[PDB]
């Protein structure tokens, strides 16, 4: 159905999302601050354990996607009575993947959040085809061709949308 | 396991405040908003409100604002209506809803009954009446009351008349069956009637 | 809020009939628009979700249709089982219902079987049986004399299967304006009778 999807205990999707994810990271090197742009690849899975459609006082629903050598792109949600949206993107990459990271004079993990401005109505899906940004630290996060949903009560994307502000 | 348990009946006075719960369970609580919907015969069906339970967020309708107040409590899976300055027009069942916005997925609860009255709990008398055959549950107070015929065995034939308004504020209905002719000196006829609200329970035999 | 304006209040119609509910709302509703059936006792159920789906466990005789402000529920053959308070309801923008239609099943004509029961204070019952239509006159007399105001009516919903109605009319009077009479009638007017049938004692 979707190329990112959270599952309810019924097998339901709960979180349902398409996107292709363009980063673009400024790292430490042993020459210098360079520049790395890369894509989400198309080998990227949702972490089983990671991910959640919420729990009763404890957790928040959450998509997590694990990519490349030991790296996840989690967009966390938060609801009132008529909208959501993804009020945290946390990117954690490991900067001892030489094949994203070459030169680098960490081999650290790093972990980088920020608000977002994904958000729409509750009973729509988020829309955005030309590409919502993230700024974090260092990091640039471009998620292309959007359509994202949370809260859902059934494996499918309603037929409502909130597109986002930069597609008019 | 989808399940939306409200809180029993309510007999309130005039002016008087009222407080209803509605208990979720078998989904995740703050998934979904609980909506409150009035269901009378005089207005038919009304929305008055949601809440988001988790936030507390709770959208109200034009005419139900500050009448309705909706609360909620994570802890216990626990949503509250309050109603002020209860009328006569207030008297109606409430429905708790499980429900985003689409209709597609809500649930409804059982109901809870109010009723608005200045009245005293109190319980009916159980008078008795092809041949046709009844009794008469008269003045008892508040609604409702459960009239069957031989413990449940005669079924065909019954009408249980939807109560009345006497103008003293009590309630005053009958229970009617049609028999043959012929079944009168053989079968016998019992009318249970249970006033669960005063936990008056009257068995009446019919004979002439 | 938005307004729901549904239309008619009321209709009778037979089955096998096509019956037609319309609503309009106030404002452009997005084909959020969903058709309930109420049923006493029971809280509303579902028929039709975004104009035209039909919910699972609903037959297919109930279909929906509209579009930016105008929608209708239609039942194309009418059952027995129909007889309902039909509402429509947007959740386009919060939730706001219609306000109603009352659907009544139309048949051939019963006639009322009449008993009546003899009567603190007084209260002497007359009860109509099965009758179809629901129009039907009681009128109290003791000692021919029309009494007015100290009688109230009660009705039974239409039959699952016949679509027939009973009636009680209670006469309530003090047992000393009661006790001097001796002549109580229960004269009845309906379709179904030629002429008005009095069952008294």
């Known amino acids: 159905m979707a190329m990112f999807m959270v599952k309810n205990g019924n097998g339901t999707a709960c979180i349902m999302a398409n996107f292709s994810a363009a980063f673009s990271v400024n790292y430490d090197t042993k020459s210098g601050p360079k520049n790395m742009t890369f894509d989400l690849p198309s080998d990227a899975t949702v972490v089983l354990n990671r991910s959640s459609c919420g729990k009763e006082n404890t957790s928040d629903p959450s998509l997590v996607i694990a990519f490349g050598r030991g790296h996840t792109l989690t967009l966390n949600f938060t609801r009132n009575a008529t909208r959501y949206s993804v009020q945290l993107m946390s990117f954690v990459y490991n900067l001892s993947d030489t094949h994203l990271f070459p030169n680098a004079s960490s081999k650290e993990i790093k972990t980088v959040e920020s608000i977002t401005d994904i958000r729409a109505d509750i009973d729509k899906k988020y829309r955005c085809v030309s590409g919502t940004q993230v700024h974090m630290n260092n990091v640039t996060v471009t998620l292309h061709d959007a359509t994202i949903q949370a809260y859902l009560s059934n494996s499918s994307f309603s037929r409502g949308e909130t597109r986002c502000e930069q597609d008019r | 396991q989808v399940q939306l348990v409200q809180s029993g009946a309510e007999v309130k006075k005039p002016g008087s405040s009222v407080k209803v719960s509605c208990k979720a369970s078998g989904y995740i609580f703050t998934n979904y908003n609980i909506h409150w919907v009035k269901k009378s015969p005089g207005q038919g069906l009304e929305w008055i409100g949601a809440?988001?339970?988790?936030?507390?967020?709770?959208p109200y309708s034009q005419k139900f604002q500050g009448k309705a107040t909706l609360t909620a409590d994570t802890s216990t899976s626990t949503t509250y209506m309050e109603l002020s300055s209860l009328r006569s027009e207030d008297t109606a069942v409430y429905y708790c809803?499980?429900?985003?916005?689409?209709?597609?997925?809500?649930?409804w609860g059982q109901g809870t009954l109010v009723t608005v009255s200045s009245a005293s709990t109190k319980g009916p008398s159980v008078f008795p009446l092809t041949a046709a055959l009844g009794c008469l549950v008269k003045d008892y107070f508040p609604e409702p009351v459960t009239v069957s015929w031989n413990s449940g065995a005669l079924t065909s034939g019954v009408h249980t008349f939807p109560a009345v308004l006497q103008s003293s504020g009590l309630y005053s209905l009958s229970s009617v069956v049609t028999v043959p002719s012929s079944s009168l000196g053989t079968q016998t006829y019992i009318c249970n009637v249970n006033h669960k609200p005063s936990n008056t329970k009257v068995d009446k035999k019919v004979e002439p | 809020d938005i307004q729901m304006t549904q239309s008619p209040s009321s209709l009778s119609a037979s089955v096998g009939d096509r019956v037609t509910i319309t609503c309009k709302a106030s404002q452009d509703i997005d084909r959020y628009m969903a058709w309930y059936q109420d049923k006493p006792g029971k809280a509303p159920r579902l028929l039709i979700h975004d104009t035209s789906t039909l919910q699972s466990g609903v037959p297919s005789r109930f279909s929906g249709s509209g579009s930016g402000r105008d929608y209708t529920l239609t039942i194309s053959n009418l059952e027995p089982e129909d007889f309902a308070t039909y509402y429509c309801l947007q959740y386009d923008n919060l939730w706001t219902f219609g306000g109603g239609t009352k659907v009544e099943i139309k048949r051939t004509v019963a006639a009322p079987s009449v008993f009546i029961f003899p009567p603190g204070t007084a209260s002497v019952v007359c009860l109509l049986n099965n009758f179809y239509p629901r129009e039907a006159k009681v009128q109290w007399k003791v000692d021919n004399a029309l009494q007015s105001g100290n009688s109230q009516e009660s009705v039974t919903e239409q039959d699952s299967k016949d679509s027939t109605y009973s009636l009680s009319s209670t006469l309530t009077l003090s047992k000393a304006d009661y006790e001097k009479h001796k002549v109580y009638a229960c004269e009845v007017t309906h379709q179904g009778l030629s002429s008005p049938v009095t069952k008294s004692f």
């Open positions: 809440i988001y339970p988790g936030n507390g967020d709770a």
């Open positions: 809803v499980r429900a985003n916005w689409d209709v597609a997925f809500a649930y």
